[PDB]
Amino acid sequence: SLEYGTELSELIGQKYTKGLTESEASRFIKEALLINPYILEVNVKSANFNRDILSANVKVSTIY
Amino acid sequence: MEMWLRQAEDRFRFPVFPSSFSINGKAAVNSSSILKIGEIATFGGVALKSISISSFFPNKDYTFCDYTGFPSPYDCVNKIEKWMKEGFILRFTITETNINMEVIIEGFSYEERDGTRDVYFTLDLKEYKRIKIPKV
Amino acid sequence: MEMWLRQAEDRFRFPVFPSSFSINGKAAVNSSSILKIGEIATFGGVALKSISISSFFPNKDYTFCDYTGFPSPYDCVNKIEKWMKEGFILRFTITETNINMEVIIEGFSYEERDGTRDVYFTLDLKEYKRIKIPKVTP
Amino acid sequence: MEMWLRQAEDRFRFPVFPSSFSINGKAAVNSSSILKIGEIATFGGVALKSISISSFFPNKDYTFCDYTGFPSPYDCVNKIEKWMKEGFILRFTITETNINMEVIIEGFSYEERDGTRDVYFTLDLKEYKRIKIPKV
Amino acid sequence: NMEARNVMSGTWGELWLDGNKVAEVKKFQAKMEFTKEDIIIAGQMGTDTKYMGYKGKGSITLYHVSSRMHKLIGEKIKRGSEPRFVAISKLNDPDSYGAERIAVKNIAFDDLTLADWEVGVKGEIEAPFTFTEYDFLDII
Amino acid sequence: NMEARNVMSGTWGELWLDGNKVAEVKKFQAKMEFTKEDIIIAGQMGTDTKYMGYKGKGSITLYHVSSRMHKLIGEKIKRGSEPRFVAISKLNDPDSYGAERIAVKNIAFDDLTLADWEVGVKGEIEAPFTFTEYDFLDII
Amino acid sequence: QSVTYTKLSDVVDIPKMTKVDAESRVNKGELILIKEAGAIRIARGVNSLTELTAEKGEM
Amino acid sequence: STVEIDFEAQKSYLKSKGVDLSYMTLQEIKEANTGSKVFLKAKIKVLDAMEDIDLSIEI
Numbered sequence: 001s002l003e004y005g006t007e008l009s010e011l012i013g014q015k016y017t018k019g020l021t022e023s024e025a026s027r028f029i030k031e032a033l034l035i036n037p038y039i040l041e042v043n044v045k046s047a048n049f050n051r052d053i054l055s056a057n058v059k060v061s062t063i064y
Numbered sequence: 065m066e067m068w069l070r071q072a073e074d075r076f077r078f079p080v081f082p083s084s085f086s087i088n089g090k091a092a093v094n095s096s097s098i099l100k101i102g103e104i105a106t107f108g109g110v111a112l113k114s115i116s117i118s119s120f121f122p123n124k125d126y127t128f129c130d131y132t133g134f135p136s137p138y139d140c141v142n143k144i145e146k147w148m149k150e151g152f153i154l155r156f157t158i159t160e161t162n163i164n165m166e167v168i169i170e171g172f173s174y175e176e177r178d179g180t181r182d183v184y185f186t187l188d189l190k191e192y193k194r195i196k197i198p199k200v
Numbered sequence: 201m202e203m204w205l206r207q208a209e210d211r212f213r214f215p216v217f218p219s220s221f222s223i224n225g226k227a228a229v230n231s232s233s234i235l236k237i238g239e240i241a242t243f244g245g246v247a248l249k250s251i252s253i254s255s256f257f258p259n260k261d262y263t264f265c266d267y268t269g270f271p272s273p274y275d276c277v278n279k280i281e282k283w284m285k286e287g288f289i290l291r292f293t294i295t296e297t298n299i300n301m302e303v304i305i306e307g308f309s310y311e312e313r314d315g316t317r318d319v320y321f322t323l324d325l326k327e328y329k330r331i332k333i334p335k336v337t338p
Numbered sequence: 339m340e341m342w343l344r345q346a347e348d349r350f351r352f353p354v355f356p357s358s359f360s361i362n363g364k365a366a367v368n369s370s371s372i373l374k375i376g377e378i379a380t381f382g383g384v385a386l387k388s389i390s391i392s393s394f395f396p397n398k399d400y401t402f403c404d405y406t407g408f409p410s411p412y413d414c415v416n417k418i419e420k421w422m423k424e425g426f427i428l429r430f431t432i433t434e435t436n437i438n439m440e441v442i443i444e445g446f447s448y449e450e451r452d453g454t455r456d457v458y459f460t461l462d463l464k465e466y467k468r469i470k471i472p473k474v
Numbered sequence: 475n476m477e478a479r480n481v482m483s484g485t486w487g488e489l490w491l492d493g494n495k496v497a498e499v500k501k502f503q504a505k506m507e508f509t510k511e512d513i514i515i516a517g518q519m520g521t522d523t524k525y526m527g528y529k530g531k532g533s534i535t536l537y538h539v540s541s542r543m544h545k546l547i548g549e550k551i552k553r554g555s556e557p558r559f560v561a562i563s564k565l566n567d568p569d570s571y572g573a574e575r576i577a578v579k580n581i582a583f584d585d586l587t588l589a590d591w592e593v594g595v596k597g598e599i600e601a602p603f604t605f606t607e608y609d610f611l612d613i614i
Numbered sequence: 615n616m617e618a619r620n621v622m623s624g625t626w627g628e629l630w631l632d633g634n635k636v637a638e639v640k641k642f643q644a645k646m647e648f649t650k651e652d653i654i655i656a657g658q659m660g661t662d663t664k665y666m667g668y669k670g671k672g673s674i675t676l677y678h679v680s681s682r683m684h685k686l687i688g689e690k691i692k693r694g695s696e697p698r699f700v701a702i703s704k705l706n707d708p709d710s711y712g713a714e715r716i717a718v719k720n721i722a723f724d725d726l727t728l729a730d731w732e733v734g735v736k737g738e739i740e741a742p743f744t745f746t747e748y749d750f751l752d753i754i
Numbered sequence: 755q756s757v758t759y760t761k762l763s764d765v766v767d768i769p770k771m772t773k774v775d776a777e778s779r780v781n782k783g784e785l786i787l788i789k790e791a792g793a794i795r796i797a798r799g800v801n802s803l804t805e806l807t808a809e810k811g812e813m
Numbered sequence: 814s815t816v817e818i819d820f821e822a823q824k825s826y827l828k829s830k831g832v833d834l835s836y837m838t839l840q841e842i843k844e845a846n847t848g849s850k851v852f853l854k855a856k857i858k859v860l861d862a863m864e865d866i867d868l869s870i871e872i
Contacts, residue, residue, distance in 0.1 A: 009791040012759040014862035019066055019159025021863060027164055052864040059871045086311030091284055093306055093326060095248075097228070102245035104329050107287035107304060124696065127720060127746070161312075162274045180694065201657050217655045222449030227422050229444055229464060238366070238383035240467050243425035243442065263558065263580060263606075264653055264662045296657075297450075298412045314666045316554065339517045355515045402513050402522045434517075452526045453659035497616040527654070529661045539620045540754050541714060551648060556665060582663055585647045588716055588748060589672075589703045591624035592641035604650075606660050712840055756862035798864070813859070 006032040011054075021054070022047050029058060038062055066130065066159045067117075069144075071152050076143065079134040080126075082119040087163065089113050112191040113165070115156070120184040137183040141174055144187070148172050153192055166192045202266065202295045203253075205280075207288050212279060215270040216262075218255040221294065225249050248327040249301070251292075259317040273319040277310055280323070284308050289328055302328045340404065340433045341391075343418075345426050350417060353408040354400075356393040361437065363387050386465040387439070389430070397455040411457040415448055418461070422446055427466055440466045479569045489534070490562040492546065498539050500598070502563050504532035504578050504605070530605040532578065534561075538590075538597030547586055558582060564612075575612035581605045619709040629674070630702040632686065638679050640738065642703050644672035644718050644745070670745040672718070674701075678737030687726055698722060704752075715752035721745045761795035762787070768794060818843060819852035826850065 007028045011021050026044040033042045039062055046057040067078040092108035121137035122129060134140070147154065148169040157164040171188040203214040228244035257273035258265060270276075283290065284305040293300045307324040341352040366382035395411035396403060408414075421428060422443040431438040445462040489499040509526040536542070550557040559581040566573040584602040591597055629639040649666040676682070690697040699721040706713040724742040731737055768787055779786050780797055783804045788797045806812055820843065827834055827845060834842065 008866060009759075011866075012864055013756050015755065017066065017159075018863075020068065020157065023157055023159060023164050025866075049863065052861045053867055054863050054865070055867045055869070057869050057871070062872070084311060084313040086309060089281070089284065089308045091287070091304075091306055093304065097245060098331065100245070101331065102329075103228070103247045104331065105248060105304070105326060110285050110287075126696065127698065162278060217657070219654050220449060220451040220656055222447060225419065225422065225446045227425065227442075227444055229442065233383065234469065236383065237467075239385045240469055241386060241442065241464060245425075246423050260556065262556065262662075262664065264655065298415060316664065316666065355517070357514045358516050400522075400524065402515065450656050453657060454524065454526070455657065456524075525659075527659045527661055537616075537621050539616065539622070540711065541750075544750065545753070551665065551668065580662075582650070582665075583648070584650075585645055588644040588646065588718070589705070590643050590645070591622070591627045591703075591705060592675075593625045593627070595624045595641075597622045597624060604663060606662055756864065758862065758864055813861075 003035050018049060025054065025056065029056075033060065065161070068155075068157050068159075069147075070155045070157075071147065076140070077131070077134075078119065079122055079129050079131065080119050081130055082117055085115065085117065085158065087113055087115055112193065114191070115163075115167075115189050117187045117189075118185070120182045123181040123183075137181070141183060141185075144169070144172060156189055168192050201297065204291075204293050204295075205283075206291045206293075207283060212276070213267070213270075214255065215258055215265050215267070216255050217266060218253055221251060221253065223249055223251055223299065248329065250306075250324070250326050251299075253323045253325070254321070256318045256320040259319075273317070277319060277321070280305070280308055292325060304328050339435070342429075342431050342433075343421075344429045344431075345421065350414070351404070351408075352393065353396055353403050353405070354393050355404055356391055359389065359391065359432065361387055361389055386467065388465070389437075389441075389463050391461045391463075392459070394456045394458040397457075411455070415457060415459075418443070418446060430463055442466050480571065482565055482567045482570050482574075484565075486565060486567045488564045488566075491534075492559050492561075496536065496542070498537040500535040500537060502532070502534055502561075504530070504561075504563070504576070504608070506530050506608075530578075530608070531602075532605065533600065533602040535601070536599045538599050543583075543586060543599065543601060544588075547583070551586075556582075562611075570614070572614040573612045574614050575610075577609040577611060578605050579607045579609065620711065622705055622707040622710050622714075624705075626705060626707045628704040628706075631674075632699050632701075636676070636682070638677040640675040640677060642672070642674055642701075644670070644703070644716070644748070646670050646748075670718075670748075671742075672745065673740065673742040676739045676741070678739055683723075683726060683739065683741060684728070687723070691726075696722075702751075710754065712754045713752045714754045715750075717749040717751060718745050719747050719749070757796060757799040759790075759795050761793040765794045814855065814857050816853060816855045819854045822852035823847065826852070 008025065011025060014021070016024065025047070029044055030042045033039055039060060041061045043059045044056055045059060046055070048055045065081065067081060069076050069078075090111045092111065093105050094108045095103055095105045097103050121140045122134075123137055125132060135143075151168065154167055154169070155165070156167045167189040169187065170190050172185065174183050174185040176183060201217065203217060205212045205214075226247040228247060230242045230244045231239060232242070233239050257276050258270075259273055261268060271279075287304065290303050290305070291301070292303045303325040305323070306326050308321070310319050310321040312319060339355065341355060343350050343352075364385040366385065367379050368382045369377055369379045371377050395414045396408075397411055399406060409417075425442065428441055428443070429439070430441045441463040443461065444464050446459065448457050448459040450457055484501070487499070487502065489496045489502055507529050509528065510523040511526050513522040513524060546559070547557065561578045561581055562575065563578070564573060564575045581603050582605070584604070587599055587601070590599070624641070627639070627642065629636045629642055646668050647670075648668050650663040651666050653662045653664060686699070687697065701718045701721055702715065703718070704713060704715045721743050722745070724744070727739055727741075730739075765787070768789065771788075776786060776788050776797055780800065783800055783802045785800065786797050787794060803810070823845065824834065824842060826847060827842070832845075837845070
């Protein structure tokens, strides 16, 4: 359907600036993960740029 | 930090970053009174956020500008006025903050007040929520 | 003194103590009138208190900070915004005073206004009360 | 001059006398318009007086205090707050004036705003009149 | 009793800034200011006060022999940190009763001087600041 | 240890304005000023501060031998453009430790003097300005 | 920007190649067109250099 | 980024010309005449585009 998946492939190659890339990555991950009824909240906390690699820390809270 | 207003693939970036920005939020509280106990209150729901921006569109390449290559002042004016006219749903984001949401334009005012041909503006935005209609 | 907001076991302590705080209290007075006597008044119960707080969330460790180890400004903003959105019942306390009660959040606004990346905020809280439920007589 | 608030035998005397005090009084006037003569008015009755007080409760024995032996700031706060909560009818008097009447408390606000731990307050009082039911 | 010899001369002062001796000091000031609130009572003619808070102020003056202040501040203000410093002043006149050593702590400077010269004039630097706390090491 | 000979005399200064040497310079000033906000906390007596921003101020003084400032400005202000300039100041006293060379960038002048003369008085020009950034080339 | 993952709207189709083939070609220092994420785009923006010394790093 | 006078290169040029470098001081070495030749040095760091994502997911 139109809900399943992630748009992270649109960021490869620095199409946007760095700050816009960070914002978009966080929003993409949150909106993609929140469709599972067993997942309650998603937080993308850290974000770092080193050479061509973007790193982040994601924390998922479930019912269990 | 950077400020963007985007409609699908059509994006606009503000050339001069404003002096300040503030987000307003509220919640509704319903109050009743009991004989001989007094007032009580219960939660009633949250309202939509609002945000107002004040800056100017420069008529020349200043040292303090965010980047180079922005359009003329009245080109920016015409673009934003068209967006407000048709009632488009836009995406507003300020980088390095938690402000990234869909909005709608409530007001737009612009003026000229000196000898530089710069155009000062004020833009009022309101948070947008779509309604979900259940089916079976 | 210290300022705390607690939701069950989830506790938050404000990094910077505000410049002032004030409690507002009122009582309801009913107004009537009597012919040839003028206005009269009666007591109509006490109203809920309210308090408003103004300070900022620091982006770095300052010498006037209450303690070290506090979260980032937008983490604090996110926590308080989530609480306001869900309509939780919280406990608000200022130590060394008489302020210790249950509250509910009415408004929250924040802004940035200089080059330091500090976040200035204003928080409006309203007191919360519970009514006893009747019991069937034995 | 001294300022007292008393509930039967339970009496409280303010430790710091305020900078000023004012009493407000009004009367009602009913207006009608008669053809070709204009407006006329008649007496309609008097309203209840009101009085507002601003001062602070000291946290130490100052030189300018009215007396010695007053309770702590929050003890005063708690006592007045209880009086307001139960809706007691109190007697308010300022010595060396004509102010001596029964009142009821309408509002109470207190705050701390410096490094001395003194508590500033504002107290709103309204005149109380009992209604007489005739019998036979 | 007082002798004219017991007045302290300012030539016998010394200054340490961030742990380093400043041999080119010219003068040093440090002072605490108290904030008062006026108390007025209806029916009484007199007026009284109560203390509200306090603040610290001071300044330093040096001969211009090197670029000490620029190295001290550097890029710390530009990058956005909050540099704070400690100063120690001593006044030890041989003809007085004793010495006087004070530590001034948590110092924030008010500005920075890059260039200030004029033809036929010797160079000097002035640097005001504010602080929050102090200690007495030697008392007299 | 300090010597009297180490104090820099202003007669040894030099100024470059937009890449041209200015031999009629009389004095040069340039200073950065920091903005502070007072922090007050209920229940504590002491008052603290935090930095908010900075600004640059300065001025130049010249002997009047030609119309340098008018040619430098020209019609740029009248035509509505925004002209900016770069200034380099050097201070090299032979008796001191070394030289001190600073570059002051993004200069905006405050006014323009067309004529200021009086019978029996020699002419001078004063030119205040503001700037935004600076670089250090030689540190003493 | 970088040319990596830039898509060409003009191109209609290209000869099929497997993922391991594309990876091995890229490791050899070749610029190739691939089909990924529902479009036709280039794989990676690398040049012909393969052997690296102390003087010439991976950058 | 930084731009500066290359001190070692000037020292080597002066040594090659045969001037006695031991007697002069550092300021004199910096400001010595070199005869139509200039030596400078600089430091930069070049950015790269983002092309990979590393996610560390907690529970």
